[PDB]
Amino acid sequence: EVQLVESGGGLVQPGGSLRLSCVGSGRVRTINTAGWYRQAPGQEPEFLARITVGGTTSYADSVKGRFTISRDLAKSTVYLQMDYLKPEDTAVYYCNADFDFGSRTAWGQGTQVTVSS
Numbered sequence: 001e002v003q004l005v006e007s008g009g010g011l012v013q014p015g016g017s018l019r020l021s022c023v024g025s026g027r028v029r030t031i032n033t034a035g036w037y038r039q040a041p042g043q044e045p046e047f048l049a050r051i052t053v054g055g056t057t058s059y060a061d062s063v064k065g066r067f068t069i070s071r072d073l074a075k076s077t078v079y080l081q082m083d084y085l086k087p088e089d090t091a092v093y094y095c096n097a098d099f100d101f102g103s104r105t106a107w108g109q110g111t112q113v114t115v116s117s
């Protein structure tokens with residue numbers, strides 16, 4: 001059993017920046033990969049980034065050069081550094097973790113990011 005808790009969203013102006021946290025608890029030593037997803041109003045959830053235990057990162061075209069995913073194994077936390085923020089980045093951001101040799105998956109509760117004014 002792995003649980004994920006998110007924090008760090010909020011309201012920011014276009015051009016601002018935010019860091020989102022994804023704190024994992026439970027059998028975190030079985031986690032294989034972690035990823036960040038977002039769900040815009042009225043849209044399917046969308047893959048954003050992915051990171052392995054070793055630190056290899058993968059990104060979608062929509063956030064390449066603007067968002068950064070990292071992980072701190074000492075704290076069981078995965079971060080999403082959201083920079084160069086556009087109004088189109090307004091969404092609920094979700095983190096996930098694949099564990100037990102990628103057989104199971106856990107999701108965070110989501111955190112709202114609003115880019116306005």
Ligand SMILES: CCOP(=S)(OCC)Oc1cnc2ccccc2n1
Pocket residue numbers: 004022023024028029030031032033034051052053071072073075076077078097
């Ligand atoms: C949401 C938290 O994700 P992370 S930092 O994994 C990102 C891939 O979880 C952890 C934490 N400790 C670990 C120790 C050994 C092996 C894997 C671990 N994964």
